[PDB]
Amino acid sequence: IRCIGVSNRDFVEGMSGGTWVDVVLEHGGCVTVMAQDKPTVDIELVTTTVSNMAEVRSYCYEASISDMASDSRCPTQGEAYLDKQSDTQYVCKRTLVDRGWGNGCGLFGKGSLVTCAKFACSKKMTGKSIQPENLEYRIMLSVHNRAKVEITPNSPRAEATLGGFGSLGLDCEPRTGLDFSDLYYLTMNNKHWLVHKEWFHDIPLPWHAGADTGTPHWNNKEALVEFKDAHAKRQTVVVLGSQEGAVHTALAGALEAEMDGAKGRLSSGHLKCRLKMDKLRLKGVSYSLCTAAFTFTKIPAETLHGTVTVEVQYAGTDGPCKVPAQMAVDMQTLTPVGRLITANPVITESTENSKMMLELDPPFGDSYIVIGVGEKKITHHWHRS
C-alpha cells in the first residue's frame, strides 16, 4: 500500500465525473487522488533529472608547471622580454633586481627581469548549468499495478496503462516550475554537488569558460603559481600542490547530488498537473459480493492524516470477489456515513485465506467500521478528533 508510512504526504481530493484536479507534486511525497466510480489513485513525483548539462566553468585544483625562462637586463639597458609572453598558455611576472659587477653587469642599480612558465592542468573540477529544457520528471502512478511515466518539458503529455484498470492520461508543466535559474551542478572528481552561482563564480582558482576542444585558456593562473625570490637572472616558480581537501573543507555543506549515468538526479520538484482518467475502469463491478467472513489480522490503526488503515483476512473459495466494507453510526440498520479511500475494494487471490489492506476516512466522532455483510461481519469502534 502506498502512502502508508510516507511522511510528506498529501491526500488531496478530486471531482467525481469531472477529471480535473490541482496536483502539486514534490520530490519524495504523495498525492492520493481518489475519484468517482473509478479506482482511487496515487500520483507521486519520484525523480527529477537533467541531461545535456552545458559546462559553465572549470576550475583547476591541481596544476602542472612546465618549461620556464628568465630574461634579464642591466641597469639603464631597458626592459626585458621573453618569447612566450604574449603566449596565452604562459604565466609571467616582471620585477626589478639588484644588478652590479657581481651578476654580470658593468653598472650598479636595478635591472629588469621577466620570468615566464607554461601552465598545465592535472585535475580540474567542473561547474555545469541547469536549464528548464534539461529537467525531466519521472512520475509514478499507482492504484490505491503501478505504471511509471516521464514528463519532459519538451513533451508534457503522458499516458500510462495499469492492468485491467484501463489508462491514465497526464498533462503538466507550469512553465518555469521549480526554476534553477541560480544553482550550479558542480562535479569534482566523481562526487557531485549543487552549489550557488555566486559562490562558484568567486572561487580563488584558475578557470576557463565552456568545454574543451583544443587546450583551454585558464584565467587567474597565478592562483596556483607563485613567483618566489629573484636573483639577477633567475627567479623561481612554484605550484601549490593539489587542492582537493581545500575544496572539500569548503563544500562540507552544499546539497550533494547523485547521478547515473551522466544524467544528474536532483532532490527537488514542484510540478502543476492536469490529468484525465476517462479510460479508467475499476476492474469489474461484475465481481460477486464476498460471502464468507474476515478477520482483523492487524488492529485498526490510525494514520497521521486522520484516515485509518485496516487489515483483513478472508476465509473463502469465493474470491475473486467484492469486499463489503463501510462505516456506520446507526448500526441498526445500516447506512454508511464516511467514505472509502480505498474505493470499491476487491479480493482477487482465489483460495484460501487471503489477506487485504484498506484505507478509510471516518466521520468526526464515534463511528463503527464494518467488514463483511450480515452474519459473521466485523465491527470496530473508532473516534475521530
Epitope: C74, T76, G106, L107
Partner: antibody
C-alpha cells in the same frame, strides 16, 4: 695600460676641471668606464661609472653634483668633470675599464692640484 | 647604503720566501663579490684576485684569494722583493668600496 689619461692639472679653488681617458683599439663596445679617486693616505674611492653605448652613468652619492661623467663614442674618449673644487678635491684621479670583472685596467692617473 | 671594508693591518712585515695573510672584513654580506689590488709605489693599482678567490691574468699562484660571507683573506706565499706594495680589497656586491689598504714591508 690600454688607457691613456690626460696630464696633471692646476686649478684655482672654486674653478672646475675636465679630465679625459681614452681606450679601445678594436671594435668591442661591450665594456664600461669607471673613475676612482685616490686621496693622500692612499685611500681609494669609487666615484662613478659609464657605459659608452647608451651613456648610462652611475655616480657615488658622495660625488653627486661634484662629478659629471660624459662619453665620446667615436673617439672612445670618456670624460669626468669636477666643479667648485676645494683642497680636498686635490688628489690622483685614476680611470678604470671593466671588461669582465672588477677594475680590470687602470690608467696612470691624473694628478689634480687645487690651489691659488 | 655603503659597505665598509675593514683591513685591521695598516702595515705588515715579512721576509723573502715567507707567507703573509692580509684580512679584509666586510661589515655586511657581500658573498664572493670581492677583488684585490696590488699597487707598487709610483705605479697604478692592478687586479690580482677577483670573485674572491680567482686570480687575474699574469698573477702567479703565490697569490691566493679566499673567503666568503664577510671575511676574505689574501694570502701571498713565497714572498719576493718585488712583492712590496699596498694591497687593497674591494667589494662589488653593492656600490664599490675599497679597503683602507695594507702596506707589505720586507725585512732582511
Amino acid at each position: 695600460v690600454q688607457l691613456q689619461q690626460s696630464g696633471p692639472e692646476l686649478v684655482k679653488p672654486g674653478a672646475s676641471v675636465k679630465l679625459s681617458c681614452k681606450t679601445s683599439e678594436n671594435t668591442f663596445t661591450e665594456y664600461t668606464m669607471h673613475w676612482v679617486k685616490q686621496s693622500h693616505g692612499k685611500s681609494l674611492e669609487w666615484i662613478g661609472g659609464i657605459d659608452p653605448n647608451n651613456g648610462g652613468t652611475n655616480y657615488n652619492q658622495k660625488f653627486k653634483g661634484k662629478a659629471t661623467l660624459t662619453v665620446d663614442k667615436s673617439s672612445n674618449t670618456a670624460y669626468m668633470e669636477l666643479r667648485s673644487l676645494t683642497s680636498e678635491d686635490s688628489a690622483v684621479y685614476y680611470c678604470g675599464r671593466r671588461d669582465y670583472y672588477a677594475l680590470d685596467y687602470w690608467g696612470q692617473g691624473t694628478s689634480v692640484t687645487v690651489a691659488s | 647604503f655603503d659597505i665598509v671594508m675593514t683591513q685591521s693591518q695598516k702595515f705588515m712585515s715579512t721576509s723573502v720566501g715567507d707567507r703573509v695573510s692580509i684580512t679584509c672584513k666586510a661589515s655586511q654580506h657581500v658573498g664572493s663579490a670581492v677583488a684585490w689590488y696590488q699597487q707598487k709605489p709610483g705605479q697604478s693599482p692592478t687586479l690580482l684576485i677577483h670573485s674572491a678567490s680567482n686570480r687575474y691574468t699574469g698573477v702567479p699562484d703565490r697569490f691566493t684569494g679566499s673567503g666568503s660571507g664577510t671575511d676574505f683573506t689574501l694570502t701571498i706565499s713565497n714572498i719576493q722583493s718585488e712583492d712590496l706594495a699596498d694591497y687593497f680589497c674591494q667589494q662589488y656586491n653593492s656600490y664599490p668600496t675599497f679597503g683602507g689598504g695594507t702596506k707589505l714591508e720586507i725585512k732582511r
